[PDB]
Subunit: 266 residues, 4 copies
């Protein structure tokens, strides 16, 4: 009669998988992912930090761009994550096997990462990736220092329970630049109200809008660059149109309020 369906691969728009050469953000910060997925390399005298890696199949491209930047596999010391979904943490397990890198994440992100994104609160097992273990668990507001660059965690639960913004200060033209890598504030296909797997979802999102609003934020970057109005293919104008953290938070709250209203009506 009728067999069970085949497994369906997690497929994405081609631009999410389009390799790009390293794009400099500030003196020591580079976008090294693809056109439409962020993966940030921060280079220090004492080794390199990677914030996100994009999709699972991006590992070799990431290592190629690191090499181009002067970063060997031994030189990658630390991987940080916005959140532990397949399109942002996808290649973490493989990067750990192929480099010196250790992962630091909050408890929520660590337990989702360790199950490869399976049993997702909203997606079930539809969007899985190779599991990885965290080496260090961070608390809200905790700092991690690499080669003199200080990264601060700001929890902003919602898109996932463990969603995190990471902030650090780089330089450019001799001046300090406070970079805010703010996580996703979307809720794609989520049941927002009365969700038994996430009862306080709405409150957490609202607190997260306020957290993002208030971040130290000369420059905002986001895991999907379009959410902060970056265009990584636009070269010297890639960041010209970028949103402030205040504007990003406001746009995400407006969208969220619309989704709530549509869910009540739907």
């Amino acid at each position: 009669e009728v067999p069970l369906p085949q497994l369906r691969a997690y497929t994405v728009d081609a631009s999410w998988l389009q390799p790009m050469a390293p794009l400099q953000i500030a003196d020591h910060t580079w976008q090294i992912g693809t056109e439409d997925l962020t993966a940030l390399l921060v280079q220090t005298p004492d080794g390199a930090v990677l914030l996100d890696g994009g999709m699972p199949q991006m590992a070799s491209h990431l290592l190629d761009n690191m090499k181009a930047r002067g970063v060997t596999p031994r030189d990658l010391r630390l991987i940080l994550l916005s959140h532990a979904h397949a399109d942002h943490a996808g290649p973490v397990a493989e990067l750990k096997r192929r480099t010196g890198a250790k992962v630091a994440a909050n408890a929520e992100s660590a337990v989702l990462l360790a199950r490869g994104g399976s049993d997702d609160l909203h997606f079930g097992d539809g969007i899985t990736y190779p599991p990885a273990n965290a080496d260090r668990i961070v608390m809200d507001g905790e700092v991690i220092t690499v080669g003199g660059i200080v990264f601060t965690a700001h929890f902003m639960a919602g898109h996932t329970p463990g969603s995190t913004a990471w902030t650090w200060t780089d330089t450019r033209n001799g001046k300090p630049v406070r970079i805010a890598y703010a996580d996703s504030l979307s809720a794609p296909g989520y049941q927002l109200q009365g969700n038994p797997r996430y009862p306080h979802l709405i409150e957490d999102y609202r607190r997260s809008f306020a957290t993002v609003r208030a971040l130290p934020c000369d420059v905002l970057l986001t895991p999907h660059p379009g959410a902060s109005n970056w265009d990584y293919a636009a070269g010297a104008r890639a960041g010209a149109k970028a949103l402030t953290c205040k504007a990003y938070a406001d746009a995400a709250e407006q969208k969220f309020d619309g989704q709530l209203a549509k869910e009540t009506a739907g």
Copy 2:
């Protein structure tokens, strides 16, 4: 010359290790731990639930009291935890090996449980126990239903990041009894202010006082019975002097404020 010190066992007052027979709290809820450590057995038509197990060496005593209550190892379905320290989650790994029980806990409690309490934010490796894995991760406000009894999680971070109050409604003399098993609100030897491993410690405690204040709470129990003024050795008057959740929260906040002041002066 001078060898490194021997490992120091986690030792406790004798009353914490003094076995007691099952003490009935309500129609289906029993204290089955020791005189000075709580371990709550909730019996349903559909299997039994255990909330905490006390110290690591209490596993066999717990199983003996379960048998006395009509609960075989196969009948224990679920273990819930106040928090994942050695004096409350100690025997969880062994109970999982010896019974049908699965563990449900929040992400913070799950990652501390999986490392056997090692790398504690405050105690280091001084207070470890056999590690165990959680089978289900719960979110704040999530419910779990066993044999018709509904348990609700209320996160109350502070004593540990994953500290949780568990609430359920039992009966007694035909009437409903709203039981609140509220976690510890102590901070024994903790650095409260400017703690790099827990930057928002003070805020979390203050929110946790408010959470405990507001719990549905005809009857309060606590992992250390003395914190809620229970005397498990007093038989028919064991619970007579018990605090309300409001009074427990207020006393813990008063103590916490004193500790803050002493830390500033110390």
Copy 3:
């Protein structure tokens, strides 16, 4: 230019995904998987045992067939595995979430299961599935007893390092039937000689042929029924043509020797 390739789903022949009603093997043993993937239900007075579950998408079908057999989710006590690949252990994580079942496996199978089949010695990350934790680690020759039925583990490393045969005695027409569930002895696309990830691969396979040869084996079953010449769609003649364990081992060794010769020439 050219994006990175999309992720490729693990796809299989339709017959591997074709549901079938429970097929009785002996008094208490049933095939409950699909036409071309084995999943064995063994029913005891003291709960049920499942040996393999097939592909990840088979979980609900398995639970439907268990219900048909009188086995509720609470009644499933134990999951055993031939080996921890996606086409045999696929639905284990979900079954653990949805039933009372605990997993017993050897250390090799446990560490592959816990990484969802990623970083496979031969397949890399091409064939992954939701990760699951083992509850009990078994040693070679160890027995596990459920409701009076005694299961014995026989390690037969090769297809995976943790490949295992499981044996037990059922009954049929008042007589004992020694059932041998022997794991795969294939090496699909494997580098056999000088493999840096499995240096003693050839020796392990040869020992495994001898192990399978000698199993207590009135009736042989295999994870892919065609390997033991079962036809689960043939009803009352499904097992008529089944191989002996001796014949299965001999055929697998003949095939393996051919593959070795072809690899030397290739």
Copy 4:
């Protein structure tokens, strides 16, 4: 009446905890543990390797001796283990937190390490330590190369299921020196015959005697130096009396045969 007993710390002879300065074994290999517990530092141009760390409380001493040798925490790349008991793998978790080091171990050692030595086949929970995760799983005969030094794993199951000998070639006075770090072959208090948790214990020990016999072995070292007749306190004559691998294997088999006979009589 009578409380349950206090937890009993894992205590050891003082000499096992007596710090010593680094003792050179060959051009790039040093003993850096205590008088009576081995911890081997192998220094390469490309970072350092540690084989065992001794007891849990030795972490800081190990890092002090590494510093004395020119090895900063960032420089420690790899930790290898003889076996995952508290007196040899004790400080691994803490070393991972405090250094760049990643752990490579076989599956058996990895699952015992991840449970901090709890649920030991012979010791139960009497001898536990902080749990740690392996970063790489090795197979029998697999090699790992650091800064040009090639380490080969030789499984020698018995003392634990995951017991391993590690071999590598160093130099001394311009000549190659084949170093064999052979694991323990003792069975302290073990039930050898008919052990339900280790049915093939005797066969594994006998195969392990043969494995040790045949190792490439200009110089033998062992986790307890006295087992190979090393005296780390004897300075320039520390290794003068050391056994060959053949003699070590023979002495261990003689002892094992005596223990078998005594167990039959006991």
